[PDB]
Structure formats: C-alpha cells, structure tokens
C-alpha cells in the first residue's frame, strides 16, 4: 500500500522521495524526511485554499480565480511575509486610498 | 523610436492603478527610461540563458529564470 | 506530471462545493514547487555545516522553523510530527 | 398650488395652478439604446468598504453610509448588494427621497420655485428628467421648433452627443430659474451605471427663500436674452454675449469614423 | 433660446473615480503590439535574428506592470511626505535611491 | 569663546567619518544581548559573536540614518524626525 | 532594562557618522526599538542554529550564517 495511506496524508510521499534523491541535495536521506515535508506542504496548501475559498465565497462565486488568491494572500499577516517578493500574474493590487487625498 | 509607443494615457493608467491623483509633465519621460533600463536588464539575462541553451527561440521559462535571478519570483508562467 | 489532482483532493476536503480555474491551478503548482525548493535548499545547507551525509526529519524540522513565521511554523511542526509518528506507529 | 391631477383642465400654457396640459415624467426614457456601455463588464459592482453594526439605531446610532463612505465622496450611489442592505442612505435616486417644493409666481420673468421650509446644504431637491435625444435628431428638431416661436427651450446636454429634452414631458424641476447668485447647483451622479443629473443645495436656505441654479451660459441663434434678477453683479443676459454654433450648443457629435461630408 | 449644459465635475473627482475603477480590475494596461515591438527592438541589440514565445512576452509585460505599479506606490508616499499632491521626478529619484536602484 | 551652532556639528561629522572605531560601549551592549537572548535559558557566547553583532548593528544603524538624512533633506528640513525613519523603513521594505 | 544603556551620546555619534547635522529629541526611542527588533531577529536565528548544533555556546559562525540568511554577509569573522 502507498506510504501516503500509512501516513494519513494526501500528497504523494514517493514522488517527494524521488525528487530528494534526484535533486542533488545530499548523499543520503532519512525515511521520515519526505513524509514530514509532504505534511508541511499539505498544510500550507490547505491553508491557502481555505483562505482562497473564503475570499471566493465573499464575492458570490464558485470558482477560485487569481484575484481571489491575491486577496487571500495579501489580506493575511503571515502569508504576505512569506510571499512578499512574489508577483502573481493577473492578480492586481489591494484597493486603498490615502486619507490626505479624499475631499 | 518604439519607446514612444508606451502612451501618455497608458502611463497615466498605471499611475491611477498605483493610487496617484495628479501627474506632473515629466513623469512620462522618467518612466520611459526606467522601463527601458529594467527591460534591458531582464532581456539581457534571458538572451544569455537562451544562448547558453543553444536555442534560437526565447522560452518563457528563460524569462522566469531571469526574473528569479533579479529576485522577482513570478507565479503562473511555469 | 504535476500536483493538480492532489490539489483537487485537498480542495474538496476544505470546500466541498467549489471549483478552481486552471490559472489558479498553475499558480498553486508554482507555489508548491517554490516552497519545496526553499525547504530542500535550506535543509541541504543545514546538513553541510555539521558535515553529515543524511538529511533527516530533524533537518527538515530545523529548516521549517527557520523559514516559516511564528504561528505558522508551530502548526507546521505539529502536523509533520503527527504524520511521522503515524508513519511508524 | 401644484395639485397634480390626471384630468386635463382649462389652463392654457402657464402651468401655475393647473399642471395637466402637458404630461409628467418618471425616470427618463431612451430611443436608440444599444448594449455598448461600461454597464456590466467593469462597473458590475462598486461596493463600499464598510463594517457596520446596524443593530443600534435611535440610541448611540450613527446613520449608515454618511459622508465617510467611499461612494458618496465619489458621487456614486450604492447598489442593492450594499452590506447595509435596506438601511444605506446613498440610494436617493431609487427611493425617491425628495424635498418639499412648490410652484407659484414670484417675478414677471417667469415661473419658479420657493422653498417651503428650512433646507440645509448638500441636500438633494429634484432630479432632472426628460426625453433623451440622439445624434441626428437634435439639429433637425431644433430648427423645426425654432420656427414655432417658443420662449422656453428645455434642452440640457448630458454628454458631447446626448441632449435631454424636457418639453413634451417634464417633472417639477422644469420651472427653476436662473440667477447670478446661485444657492442650488447641478451634479452628475452615476446610478446603476447610467449617468443622471441631480440638484443639490449649497447653504442654509431659510423658509420662504428662492431656489435657483446657475446656468452654464449658452446661446443658440442670432438673438440674445437677459436676466431680471440683478442680485449684485448679474451678467444681464442669459447666455452672455458670445455666440456659439449648433454643434457647440449641443456638444458636436462624436463623429462616426466614416464622412468628411458630414462636417461640410 | 439656447441649450444650457448642466455643470462640470470638480477636478480630482473623476481622477479618484478612475483610481477605484483601475484598482478594482485586473487586466493589462499597456498596449500589447507596441510593447512587443519595443521588446523586439531592444532585443536586437544582443543577438540578431531571434524569435519569441507569446508567453515569454506576456510574462515580461506582467513583470513590467507590477514593477511600475510598485514604483508609483512608493513614489506616492514620497510625494505625500513632501506635502504635495502633484508627483515629481525628484520623488521618483528619491524612491529609487532609497530602494537601492 | 563659542563656536556657532552647527560648526562643531560639522567638525564631529568630519572626524567621525574619518575614524573607524566603534561607537557603542561594549559592556552595555553585552548586557543587552545577554538579556534579550533569554529563546533558550542558560546560554554561553563566544566573544567574536558579540563582536560581530556590534559591527552588524552599527552598520545597520548608519545605513538607516543615511536614508533618514536623505528623507529629511527631501522634506526641506535640517532636523531629522521619526516620520523620516518611518518613511525610510516603509520604502526599504520593512 | 538594558536598552537604556544605548546612550544618547552613542546614538548622536552614530548619527554624526551617518551625516546628520541636527537631531530631534524623539529619535532615540525609535532607534532603540529598531535596534531591539534587529537584534531579536538575528539572535533568534543564531540560537536556532545553536540548538540544532547541540551546543551550549553560541559561536561566531552561527552569527555569520544568521546574517547571511537575512542578506548582510559580514566579512572578517570567518
């Protein structure tokens, strides 16, 4: 049976194992590293998709769009810090107007 | 002179997206030069990658790698 | 090959009745690849300062703690620990 | 004095006491409306950014969407998707919240309006409603109607190619006069994607005082007209002295890129 | 008898309206064919007789628009710190100097 | 005898841009580090570690004050103000 | 309370090296906070490296790596 089924995850452990053994990072890899990394990636993916889904429901839509991803990422304190130097295509900016320009 | 193709109202449009209320008359000539320098750097790096890869066509992955080299990661064109 | 079907499987667990566009799928693919590269590179760095052959779960955990912010890293570590416990138990 | 009744009566033209010689009008009507606009592609919704409470009114209760809203400052009324819902106060052209008006005789210059009760600044009074013309019909109907020997021309240019006629059908805003000391004015609000013209006050108008608005001066034929107010500097004349052309009066059409022939 | 026009927008009102209109949307603001011609011209200086991918030009356009938007976002703060509404090239130069360009 | 206000300021600018020594006192800096390193209780330090921390900190502060001075001059002021530091750290990306 | 040990003359001398002629009376409370944040970040990274290395003593190479992680790249300490 698949290692993912043993670990209770959703991302595939074996492909991560292969990429670690293939990407010239070190001489050896311990058995727990791919499972740990897959759990981390699954958690981050789930967080991003949760906030994207909330942003999508906030605009009466049923399909997540890059604008929704942009809003979800930029309206969070820590994800913005993690992705501060990343440009999302077809993402746009946050609506804000400085208070010294409004009449 | 294709640098004049980047129109005055186009630059005004970009400023409107950036949140600028009133635009001076030299911002356009400044922005043209800034964009020219930025594009020259990125294109130089991209063409370098291509010539290394022995290709004649310039792929989009080359542009992505050049932007990563500059330090501006771009999601979507992978 | 990519992570698209797995992203679908993750999405259907946190929002049942929703969809996602191909551009967003590509963006998520890039995000997964980028985080994978960051964590792997940091662990490969950590394994060299101590002159060790093997990247271990301890190495990955150290990289995670160094790379992620405060509240996010704690949950990431907890999830990874739970998974690596369930892997052997 | 207004007495809006649907039965036509025995008052010829002056419309001072019997308003049923012509017809009244609701929100305006169009003739050649096509689906080429910014209506529902980028102005689908322009929602304000408000985090209200809406459970505490009449006691520590702030009115919803006051002068701190993002739409009121930019002259846009909210849609039905407002977070306040049916408590937002921007939708004044849709709930028909109007001011108390009355039409009687003040001066021999013509008919007009006088304020019933006290009215503060930045208060809506009436919406200018009429019949929307188009490119070709304006320059024909105007020369067809100039030979009918009429004094009042109810033409107002919405855009460089749109002129609204308030002659065949008009609301209570058709009687307001001109003066060189304006206390009311006209504003260009955007409701439901369409542009509408409204009337706002500027000061604290006392009960029983005049309510006129300033004309952006314009003349159309060879003759001239003059104003009879004379507040302190009154320019003497409606339309000033300078003459402008048929196209400049209406705003000269956005020429369909056909041909030269049309200019000649 | 003449056709009177209602009124004129106060300046800055439509400017702010445009600010909202273009901050709400997500589209390309730059003329695509002129952008393409410009890229080809400036690429001719590094290798004669090249060929491009459509996505390879689209990515360049996205990056350029993002860069300019960020530059203006910082420049507007510079101008406000200078207690001005109008935006000046000295503000642009200060933004680039402090950013490190 | 008095030197006019600003003259000695320029004198100090010259002499402290000429010198290369450290400006912050080692014992207070050390106590500060060993206080805010309490993360992990009961730590021990190599001296070169604190020596490097002081260098990095003074370099960072000088590099920040340079941009602060630039902002103050752009504002047509001589005196630097905290709003200038805030603008510098806002544009810098912090 | 050892952050008060970064004295007003010390900060003034640093500003003098920075090229400042005239100093407001409110710069110091801001400078102290900025220094505290910077030191907290760097020391956090250093302590993390130490705890990974299974050491009681925080080395200088740990500090150098912590600075390299944030993009400072100090020379002179190995």
What this model shows, in words?
It is classed as transcription, transferase/rna/dna. Keywords: setd2, TRANSFERASE-RNA-DNA complex. The entry is titled "RNA polymerase II-DSIF-SPT6-PAF1c-TFIIS-IWS1-SETD2-nucleosome, 30 bp upstream". Chain A is Histone H2A type 1. The organism of A is Xenopus laevis. This is part of a larger assembly, with one copy of chain A (103 residues), two copies of chain B (78 residues), one copy of chain C (89 residues), one copy of chain D (264 residues) and two copies of chain E. Chain B is mainly alpha-helical and 78 residues long. In chain B, 62% of the residues lie in helices and 9% in strands. Chain B is elongated. The relative contact order of chain B is 0.10. Chain C has 89 residues and is mainly alpha-helical. Chain C has one domain: Histone, subunit A, CATH 1.10.20. Chain C is 78% helix and 4% strand. Chain C contains four helices and two strands; from the N terminus they run αβαβαα. In chain C, helix 2 crosses helix 3 (57-67) and helix 3 runs antiparallel to helix 4. Chain C starts with a helix and ends with a helix. In chain C, 38% of the residues are buried. In chain D, strand 7 and strand 8 form a beta hairpin. The radius of gyration of chain D is 21 Å and the shape is globular. Chain E has one domain (6-101): Histone, subunit A (Orthogonal Bundle). Chain E contains four helices and two strands, in the order H-H-E-H-E-H. In chain E, helix 3 (54-81) packs across helix 4 (89-99). Chain E is extended and about 65 Å long. Chains in contact: A-B, A-C, A-D, A-E, B-C, B-E, C-G, D-E, E-F, F-G. The interface between B and C is small, with 4 and 8 residues.
Which helices and strands, and how do they pair?
The structure is cut from a larger assembly and holds one copy of chain A (103 residues), two copies of chain B (78 residues), one copy of chain C (89 residues), one copy of chain D (264 residues) and two copies of chain E.
Chain A: H1 3-7, H2 13-22, E1 28-29, H3 32-57, E2 63-64, H4 66-74, H5 77-82, E3 86-88
Helix pairs in contact in A: 2-3, 3-4
Chain B: H1 8-18, E1 22-23, H2 27-52, E2 57-58, H3 60-70, E3 73-75
Helix pairs in contact in B: 2-3
Chain D: E1 105-107, E2 110-111, E3 124-127, E4 131-132, H1 135-145, E5 155-157, E6 163-165, E7 184-191, E8 194-201, H2 246-250, H3 260-263
Antiparallel strand pairs in D: 1-2, 3-8, 4-6, 5-6, 7-8
Shape assignment of chain C: globular
Q: Which value, in Å, is the CA radius of gyration of chain C?
A: 16 Å
Order of helices and strands of chain C: HEHEHH
What share of the residues of chain B lie within helices? 55-70%
Give a summary of the structure in a few sentences.
This is part of a larger assembly, with 1 copy of chain A (103 residues), 2 copies of chain B (78 residues), 1 copy of chain C (89 residues), 1 copy of chain D (264 residues) and 2 copies of chain E. Chain B has 78 residues and is mainly alpha-helical.
List its traits.
part of a larger assembly; 7 chains; A: 103 residues; mainly alpha; Histone, subunit A; 3 strands; D: mainly beta; three-stranded antiparallel beta sheet; 8 strands; globular; nucleosome core (chain A); chromosome (chain A); protein heterodimerization activity (chain A)
């Amino acid at each position: 049976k698949t290692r993912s089924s043993r670990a209770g995850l959703q991302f595939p452990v074996g492909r991560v194992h292969r990429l670690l053994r293939k990407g010239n990072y070190a001489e050896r890899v311990g058995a727990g590293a791919p499972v740990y990394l897959a759990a981390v990636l699954e958690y981050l993916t789930a967080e991003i998709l949760e906030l994207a889904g909330n942003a999508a429901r906030d605009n009466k839509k049923t399909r997540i769009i890059p604008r929704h991803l942009q809003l979800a990422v930029r309206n969070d304190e820590e994800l913005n810090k993690l992705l501060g130097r990343v440009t999302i295509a077809q993402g746009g900016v946050l609506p804000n107007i400085q208070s010294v320009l409004l009449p | 002179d294709n640098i004049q193709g980047i129109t005055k109202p186009a630059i005004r449009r970009l400023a409107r997206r950036g949140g600028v209320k009133r635009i001076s008359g030299l911002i356009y000539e400044e922005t043209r030069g800034v964009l020219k320098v930025f594009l020259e750097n990125v294109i130089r790096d991209a063409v370098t990658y291509t010539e290394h890869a022995k290709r004649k066509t310039v792929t989009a992955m080359d542009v992505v790698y050049a932007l990563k080299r500059q330090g501006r990661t771009l999601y979507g064109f992978g | 090959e990519s992570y698209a079907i797995y992203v679908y499987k993750v999405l259907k667990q946190v929002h049942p009745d929703t969809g996602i566009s191909s551009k967003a799928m590509s963006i998520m693919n890039s995000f997964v690849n980028d985080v994978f590269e960051r964590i792997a590179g940091e662990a490969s760095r950590l394994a060299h300062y101590n002159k060790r052959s093997t990247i271990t779960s301890r190495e990955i955990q150290t990289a995670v703690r160094l790379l992620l912010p405060g509240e996010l890293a704690k949950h990431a570590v907890s999830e990874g620990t739970k998974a690596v416990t369930k892997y052997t138990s | 004095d207004d007495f809006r009744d649907p039965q036509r009566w025995k008052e010829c033209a002056k419309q001072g006491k019997m308003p049923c010689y012509f017809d009244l009008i609701e929100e305006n009507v169009y003739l050649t409306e096509r689906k080429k606009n910014k209506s529902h592609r980028d102005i689908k919704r322009m929602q304000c950014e408000c985090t209200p409470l809406s459970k505490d009114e009449r006691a520590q209760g702030e009115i919803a969407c006051g002068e701190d809203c993002l739409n009121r400052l930019l002259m846009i009324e909210c849609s039905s998707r407002c977070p306040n819902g049916d408590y937002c106060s921007n939708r004044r052209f849709q709930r028909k919240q109007h001011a108390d008006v009355e039409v009687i005789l003040t001066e021999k210059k013509g008919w007009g309006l006088r304020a019933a009760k006290d009215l503060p600044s930045n208060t809506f009074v009436l919406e200018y409603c009429g019949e929307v013309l188009d490119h070709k019909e304006f320059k024909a109907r105007v020369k067809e109607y100039a030979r009918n020997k009429n004094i009042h021309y109810y033409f107002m240019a919405l855009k460089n190619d749109e002129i609204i006629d308030a002659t065949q059908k008009g609301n209570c805003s058709r009687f307001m006069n001109h003066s060189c000391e304006p206390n009311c004015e006209t504003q260009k609000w955007t409701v439901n994607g369409q542009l509408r013209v409204g009337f706002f006050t500027t000061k604290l108008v006392p009960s029983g005082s005049e309510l006129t608005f300033d004309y952006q001066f314009q003349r159309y034929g060879k003759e001239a007209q003059k104003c009879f107010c004379g507040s302190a500097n009154c320019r003497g004349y409606l339309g000033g002295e300078n003459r402008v052309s048929i196209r400049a009066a209406g705003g000269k059409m956005k020429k369909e890129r056909s041909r030269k022939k049309d200019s000649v | 008898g003449g056709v009177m026009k209602p009124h004129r927008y106060r300046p800055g009102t439509v400017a702010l309206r445009e600010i909202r209109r273009y901050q709400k949307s997500t589209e390309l603001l730059i003329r695509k064919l002129p952008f393409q011609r410009l890229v080809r011209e400036i690429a001719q200086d590094f290798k004669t007789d090249l060929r491009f991918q459509s996505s390879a030009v689209m990515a360049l356009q996205e990056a350029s628009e993002a860069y300019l938007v960020a530059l203006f976002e910082d420049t507007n703060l510079c101008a406000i710190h200078a207690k001005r509404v109008t935006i000046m090239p000295k503000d642009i130069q200060l933004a680039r100097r402090i950013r490190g360009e």
